[PDB]
Design a protein around this ligand. Structure first.
Ligand SMILES: CC(C)(CO)NC(=O)c1cccc(Cl)c1
Lengths: 156, 39
């Protein structure tokens, strides 16, 4: 199938027409998305088949064809870009300064941008274009606004 | 059956639209991977 590095849409034909359920990152021959997007199911890429390799519901991440490859981290100071891939709309970079999710196990960056749920899996980038995490697992605040964790996996 | 379609290159864009705030939130992460607000 298609194995070029880049950001990809995750689609289904189970519902009405073709529906975008999420987004993912192809890097080093491995497809990276959020667990809630595919529920661990196999994917199709033209004539090719992508099988799940690693996943964890609590981290809300899954890799296909190989182990998780993304290891860049937010520096805790600088602005970043959400490379948003919204349903039926063109890929768009949005620059923002992340906030923080404070948890009993440590702090994590958080991006406060409003996009439909089908945008889950869009990559968050540092100034050198390295993927520091995926957008799409977070919380809804008072006004109905959305704040996503910067969710990053471990490169073994 | 789910399928993938290429949507673009992963690059930082100079002079991208700059927006969004930076809240400091107290949150909890459950066994199901769901975040919730703690107060
Ligand atoms: C609150 C809105 C509708 C804001 O546009 N977004 C979401 O509810 C949502 C849920 C899960 C993942 C992602 Cl990316 C967005």
């Amino acid at each position: 199938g298609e194995t070029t590095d880049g950001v990809y849409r995750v689609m289904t034909r189970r519902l009405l027409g073709s529906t975008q359920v999420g987004v993912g990152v192809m890097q080093e021959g491995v497809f990276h998305t959020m667990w809630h997007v595919t529920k661990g199911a196999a994917l199709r890429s033209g004539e090719g088949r992508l099988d799940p390799y690693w996943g964890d519901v609590k981290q809300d991440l899954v890799s296909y064809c190989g182990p998780w490859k993304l290891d860049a981290a937010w520096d805790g100071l600088s602005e970043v870009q959400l490379l948003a891939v919204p349903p039926g709309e063109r890929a768009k970079n949005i620059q923002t300064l992340p906030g923080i999710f404070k948890t009993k196990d440590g702090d994590i960056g958080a991006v406060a941008l409003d996009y439909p749920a089908g945008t889950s899996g869009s990559p968050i980038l540092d100034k050198c274009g390295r993927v520091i995490g995926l957008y799409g697992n977070g919380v809804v605040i008072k006004n109905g606004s959305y704040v996503s964790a910067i969710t990053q996996g471990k490169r073994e | 059956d789910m399928y993938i379609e290429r949507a673009g290159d992963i690059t930082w864009e100079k002079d991208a639209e700059v927006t969004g705030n930076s809240p400091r939130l107290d949150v909890a992460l459950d066994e199901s991977g769901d975040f919730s607000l703690v107060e």
